Amino acid sequence: VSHLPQELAISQYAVFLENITRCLELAKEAGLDVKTVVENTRKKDAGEFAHHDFAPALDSGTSEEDRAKIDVIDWLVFQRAEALKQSNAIMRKFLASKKHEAAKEVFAKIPQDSIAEIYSQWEEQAMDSALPAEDDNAIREHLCIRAYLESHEAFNEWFKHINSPPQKPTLVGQASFTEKVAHEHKEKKYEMDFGIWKGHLDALTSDVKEKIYNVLLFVDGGWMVDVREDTEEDPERSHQMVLLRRLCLPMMCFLLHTVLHNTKQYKDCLRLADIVSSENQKLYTVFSKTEMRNLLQKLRESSLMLLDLQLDPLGYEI
């Protein structure tokens, strides 16, 4: 088949496909000796059209594409630059639909060492020279995606914990002397558990807060912003990066405000206005005017609780 040009790709897959489901791998390599990213792109295009009939919802094809990228990443980890770049593209579609488990399933198919192997030089300045503009951005985008993913992992754990507080001891009015003592013990045990459920909460609060700041104040240019400006034109990716900022930076700020308000950190809630308006990040440009007003009504709620505690609107002493 290799002798004849038309069978250059298909023959390898068929021989390779049966074997995969070692020596067989070596044989496949030999046969190859006797592109892939482009083929994947073509497949994606076919899926987007699929000729006359296209499914209204999903299905599997998006999931199938995610499986293919994770498989190539494992295969690449064992084309790793292309595997990472395609993985980012698949995850960008899943992030826009908030399919965090789908994005994470793809993320773990990427080998944990992929970043280290892709580099051509140990020294950072000489790495920049050889590393194409496509690859610098793809390494940064993947870490931006991980920073976003970690900020929903820790939030869902924290949010699970905020909805499991210890319940108050049930009161038996007109109690027997037996029930009185059992109650005195149940009351005392509750007054231990509520301190721990604050203790675990304060640790989960500190950790979830840090992750949210790592996304909102993303080092070296802001979240989902390319640092390398010499790449070829990709309007599908660049407009996706702008969109991901506008769907997820408003959402992450609202979640942080909810975390700070729930733990009573009202002074820090109001300092979200400094973070958002900041000319250093320009986060105010990723919000709609409606979302800004909705933040301003959230901040006024935190301010009320500060007045109830005897302080000024911004949590300074009167």
Add this chain to the structure above:
Amino acid sequence: LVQICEMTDNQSRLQRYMTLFAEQNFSDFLFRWYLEKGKRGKLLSQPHGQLAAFLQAHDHLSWLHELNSQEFEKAHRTLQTLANMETRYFCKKKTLLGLSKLAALASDFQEDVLQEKVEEIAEQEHFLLHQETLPKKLLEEKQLDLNAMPVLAPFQLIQLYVCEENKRANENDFMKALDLLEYIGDDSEVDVEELKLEILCKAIKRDEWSATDGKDDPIEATKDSIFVKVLQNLLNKGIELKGYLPKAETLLQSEELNSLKTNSYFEFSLKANYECYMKMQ
């Protein structure tokens, strides 16, 4: 009576219904509110009630009932007004402007009005940024609280950039202390060209003019570098760069060098470098 009954309850639907069917009760209800300062018209005395207070947000109660009613544009005006009167705490003045700006960006201003608000704000951020950039050497030397204290002016910044206390003061610190001269106000009153000398003279004191084996030691490595940093290649920018270093003085400089007692050390390479600064220019 009826106006204080509508105020003890949560019925500002009643004080709206009272002003709806009345002759001049609007000019009365506002003047009845002001006389009753801290007596009636409070939203902190009231807990339906929120709705009534919001009516009670008409005029003076806008900062709280106005945020509640989502009047972002009104909140921006009061947040800026509070930021201006703020003198007691620097950290708070910074926070109020941030909040004011976030309130205006999240409001429904036309793009033109929004541009005017963010431009007038950019000026306020510009002056504040001077007190923000105060060096962390001098703030521990003058034993100053980090946030629980007051801000600064180009004079204070220029003088603090060049203090003996600023030990690692390099080309950038002096360059930025010559950038802060266009931020003054009343240039002939506060002495522009006196400071222009004070700085270029401490720009030589830090250099340290020395001698190695009977030969001149050009310490002026910072003075050198600062005169390499004034020119932005404005020859190709169409600026008169040719003949545009007569900012610095010369005979007037050795007057200040005599005061420091350093004339004998540096006057050999002060003039020598001032020859290849007439060829550079």
